[PDB]
Amino acid sequence: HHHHMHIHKIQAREILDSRGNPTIEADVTLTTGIIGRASVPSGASTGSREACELRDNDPKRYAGKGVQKAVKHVNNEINQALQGLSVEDQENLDRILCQLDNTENKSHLGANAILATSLACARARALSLNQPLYMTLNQGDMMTMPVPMMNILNGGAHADNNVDIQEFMIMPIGAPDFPVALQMGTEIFHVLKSVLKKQGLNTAVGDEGGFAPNIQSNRQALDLLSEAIEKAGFRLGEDIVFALDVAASELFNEGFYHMYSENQKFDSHQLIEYYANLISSYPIVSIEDGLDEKDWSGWKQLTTHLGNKVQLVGDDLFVTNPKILREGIAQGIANAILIKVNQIGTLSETRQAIKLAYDNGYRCVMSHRSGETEDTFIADLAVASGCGQIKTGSLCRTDRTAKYNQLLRINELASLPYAGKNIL
Amino acid sequence: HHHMHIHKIQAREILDSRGNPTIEADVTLTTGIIGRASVPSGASTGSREACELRDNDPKRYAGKGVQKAVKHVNNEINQALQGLSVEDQENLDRILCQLDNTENKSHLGANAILATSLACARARALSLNQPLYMTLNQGDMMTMPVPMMNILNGGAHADNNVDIQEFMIMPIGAPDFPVALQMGTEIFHVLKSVLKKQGLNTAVGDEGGFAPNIQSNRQALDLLSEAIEKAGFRLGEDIVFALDVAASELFNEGFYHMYSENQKFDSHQLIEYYANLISSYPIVSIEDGLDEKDWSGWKQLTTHLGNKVQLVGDDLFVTNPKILREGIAQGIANAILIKVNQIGTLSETRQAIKLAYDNGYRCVMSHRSGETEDTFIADLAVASGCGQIKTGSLCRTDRTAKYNQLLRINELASLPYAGKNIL
Ligand SMILES: [Mg+2]
Ligand SMILES: [Mg+2]
Ligand SMILES: [Mg+2]
Ligand SMILES: [Mg+2]
């Protein structure tokens, strides 16, 4: 009977994210007793057009970062708005949530309250169907185990070192399947720890589990990773390639991009040239947010000049937002989008952005935030969407490894190809 | 009772919070219910811990694969347990121990055995349609535990110069557990500002505590004190300290080496050193203050300071009822750190707890420095009524997942918070 998908109750609670800041978790209980549960991540380098992350701003509670207001919105308005409705229709529930909030940026109820509800409903649906989450999430795309881009040296907003570039990532693109890809990246990660330790560089980790040394230059960071790849026995280019998240909106000030670690200040043109030179020296296949979220003329130039040679990922540029991605597609900027559910607030709108990217030749990279939880939703969504690439952290900290472990579990019975080099 | 019978047991290799392989098991009942559990891994491991079976293939995960343990679950353990009931935890655990037939579980591996033991416990809870902590209680009065929160990491958990492994705060003055978690978190974030303002490292070690270099252990305690005060809490009334020295890591050739302070100590001298710390700071608990083999030292420590401070045996006892029994008889320590993977079954862990309770020893439910997303120790801490948990700093989901599970239990458990009763 299909009334078994009807919602009995929705509730939320405050939990801690992986940085120690509160975030929201929602439980959706159906009339059969089944409970779908999901929690919401939180970024540090957040684009200016991300949907509203509703916080309490009480200085006497968690330094103003409580989320009891968002919890209260789930317990009250959202619960009573959705009770008796079916979780079988994800689009209908997300539509009701957006209309209940009735603001462009989800600032009445909070994008975190809406997303917690949206994802918990998706899990309640999957439990009702008695199928793994990734199966219930697929909308016809050919599923693959994704290639991970693994952020093993952290900088920028994620660490207190002098590193300007936010993320230095390795991608085990030459691996034959996902378990071996994880093994390769893990082995490189541990060799990198030894390489750093021998040079007296910091091996404590930043927010995403990558080491947080001070570096002499971005090139030194890439040299250190190259050294670790070689000492682990893998081949640059053939086995492992590089991806970067510059998070350049964090470096843009007063009309210039500031590479403080290198005492350099670049206009847009000079930073494009800077990237072209890095690409000619290292196998960098992907650059995320190479330019500022408002530098649309720069992004167009970057895409024309280097887009044939490298993947260019809009993160803050697009904020997982179909309206913004549509404008970017029309203007010809970037060729990939970083998919962050909590940048937009619902599964359904995330799916819109994915469809708009696929239909127009853009790749999708499924992504964590730097503030994670134990929730592994993005592992199932990466597989289900067939996007072929995931960005979910270094190889330490369970906020990251829990996603890698969920991919290992999915790989057991999914009988799916590894995206591998097809992502190029 | 047909609904509690085992259909199949299987295992898989996953990554722990340090990036090293570990084992996770699924126990599938004839009803289709699946109990799942994974196994943590220590860094400063006692010499008498049960065998953590690794593959030792240098071409694979630097020799730290656990496929041998996974295969022991898939084959020997599955075949031995097919058709038995998870209703009786002691029976399954007895069967697992007899199947291995070695003193330190070196044939199947304590990790293979523990993964099965805990997965069976979960499948049992699910079959009873009861929260895990409910199904784990064995008559003790349940409480929400006071957390000791390791917010400055050293020793084997970070590559800084810090000798003491763990500097912990305990929000003993909090009215309930959510407020205790809030207190510790607020201090954690303030401590980050304190360190950052002094130019000290705020990247984190294995358990989520900051990993700066320090001038001395007193300086570290001063830095924690400054953060407690700037966060607006009171030393003593609100917040007290606990330490894990992991002194077996510091012991070599008759002396304990505090390299960071350019000093070494014999056992007698290190006892004095603790006495002086305790008189300068509100330290209420010292774990592994002496080497795992320094039994004469531990006796002296216990007689001299045991009425003033909690003395937690960790490597001293390795959650092993046989060793705890010897220690109680000799009068050493007054608490035990409970680590399921030091002994290898839930049933033997429960034996240690009961043996401690029956003799006036306190129990501290504990993580390992290498954790997984598994939150079993949150439910076990509550179910045991031990009143104290050690499960990490206030960042890294390997730690916060356990605090989050305690928040979830607290919602409907209607249980008191152990508070100052832990003294
Ligand atoms: Mg960002
Ligand atoms: Mg980014
Ligand atoms: Mg230890
Ligand atoms: Mg210890």
Looking from the CA of B73 toward its CB, the CA atoms found within 13 Å total 33
B61: nearest CB among A25, A159, A186 = A186
Q: Is A420 left (phi over 0), alpha (psi -120 to 50) or beta?
A: left
| Six token digits for residue A151 | 């952020």
Look at chain A and count its residues. Answer: 424
Q: Residue B11: is it exposed, middle or buried by C-beta count within 10 angstroms (0-12/13-18/19+)?
A: buried
- Beta pairing class for B335-338 and A252-253: unpaired
Q: What is the DSSP letter of A86?
A: B
Cβ atoms of A327 and A105 within 8 Å: the answer is: no
Distance CA B265, CA B287 (A): 17
Instruction: Count other C-beta atoms under 10 Å from residue B307's C-beta.
Output: 8
Domains and CATH numbers, chain A: 6-130 (3.30.390.10), 131-424 (3.20.20.120)
Residue A410 contacts B, CB cutoff 8 Å? no
Beta strands (DSSP E) in B91-177 are 146-153, 166-170
Closest CA to B149 of B423, B415, B392, B331: B392
- Name, in order, each residue with C-beta under 8 angstroms of B366's C-beta and a sequence gap of 6 or more: B314, B337, B338, B339, B377, B389, B390, B391
Alpha carbon distance A211, A203 (integer Å): 5
Q: Check if the beta carbon of residue B46 is closer than 8 Å to that of residue B292.
A: yes
- The catalytic site residues of B sit at 207, 339
What are the angstrom distances between the C-alpha of B203 and each of A160, A244, B100, B227, B396?
7, 21, 42, 17, 12
φ, ψ of residue A243 to 5 degrees: the values are -135, 150
CA distance A98 to A78: 10
Ligand nearest to the CA of A249: 1
CA B335/CA B349 separation, integer angstroms: 14
Q: How far is the CA of B297 from the centre of ligand 3 (A)?
A: 19
Q: How far apart are CA B387 and CA B363, in angstroms?
A: 8
In the numeric block, which tokens belong to residue B398?
A: 């390997």
* Distance (Å, whole) CA A419 – CA A19: 31
Which residues have a Cβ under 8 Å from the Cβ of B229 and sit 6 or more positions away? B235
Burial track B46-71 (b if 16+ CB lie within 10 A, e otherwise) = bebbbbbbbbeeeeebbebbbbbbbb
Asked whether the beta carbons of A396 and A205 are under 8 A apart, the reply is yes
d(CA B50, ligand 3 centre) in Å: 13
Ligand 2 midpoint to CA A47 (Å): 9
CA distance A211 to chain B (A): 8
**CA A417/CA B7 separation, integer angstroms:** 30
Per the CB < 8 Å rule, is B404 touching A25? yes
Technique behind this structure? X-ray
Cβ contacts (< 8 Å) between A204 and chain B: which residues? 158-160, 201, 203-205, 210-211
Within an 8 Å CB–CB cutoff, is residue B213 touching chain A? no
Kindly provide the b/e burial profile for residues A367-394, where b requires at least 16 CB atoms within 10 angstroms of the residue's own CB.
Answer: bbbbbbbbbbbbbbbbbbbbbbbbbbbb
Backbone angles phi, psi at A362, to 5 degrees: -90, 140
In Å, what resolution does this model reach? 1.9
Give the integer Cα–Cα distance in Å for B155 and A234: 32
A204 → closest Cβ in B62, B204, B408? B204
What distance in Å separates the CA atoms of residue B423 and residue A371, rounded to the nearest whole number? 36
Spatial distance between the Cα atoms of B182 and B403, rounded to a whole number of angstroms: 11
Task: Give the phi and the psi of residue A55 in degrees, each rounded to 5.
Answer: -120, 160
Compute chain B's Rg from CA coordinates.
21
Q: Please list, in sequence order, all residues whose beta carbon lies within 8 angstroms of the beta carbon of residue B387, skipping any fewer than 6 positions away.
A: B143, B145, B146, B362, B418, B421, B422
In angstroms, how far apart are the furthest CA atoms of chain B?
64
Strands of B214-334 (E only): list them.
Answer: 240-244, 251-252, 255-258, 263-265, 283-287, 310-313
CB B53 within 8 A of CB B111: yes
| Cβ of residue A40 closer than 8 Å to a chain B Cβ | no
Give yes or no for a contact between A169 and A150, defined as CB atoms under 8 angstroms apart: yes
Burial class (CB in 10 A: 0-12, 13-18, 19+), B413: middle
* Cα–ligand 3 centroid distance for B105 (angstroms): 19
Q: Would the CA dihedral through A218, A343, A13, A4 be positive or negative? A: negative
HSE-CB for B370 with a 13 A CA cutoff: 23
Instruction: Give the minimum alpha-carbon distance from A160 to chain B in angstroms, rounded to a whole number.
Output: 7
Mutate to test the interface with B, among A399, A400, A406, A408 (most CBs of B within 10 A): A399
- CB of A159 within 8 A of CB of B203? yes
Question: Which among B61, B186, B397 has CB closest to A402?
Answer: B397
Place of tokens 């705890």: B324
CA–centroid distance for A367 within its chain: 2
Residues contacting A268, CB < 8 A, separation 6+: A257, A291, A295, A297, A298, A301
| Number of other residues whose CB lies within 10 A of the CB of residue A298 | 21
- CA separation for the pair A318, A297 (Å, rounded): 15
Pairwise CB contact (< 8 Å): B196 & A374: no
Residues 6+ apart with CB under 8 A from B147: B170, B171, B180, B181, B184, B388, B389, B390, B391, B403
Q: Does A159 touch chain B (CB under 8 A)?
A: yes
CA distance B83 to B5: 6
Contacts of A13 in chain B (CB under 8 A): 407-408, 411
Instruction: Tell me the CA–centroid distance for residue B330 and ligand 4, in Å.
Output: 21
Contacts of A402 in chain B (CB under 8 A): 373, 397
Here the tokens at position B102 are: 């070695």
Contact with chain A for residue B335, Cβ under 8 A? no
Sign of the alpha-carbon dihedral angle for B297, B300, B306, B308: negative
CA distance B373 to B398: 6
Torsion of CA A272, A274, A279, A281, to 10 degrees: 160
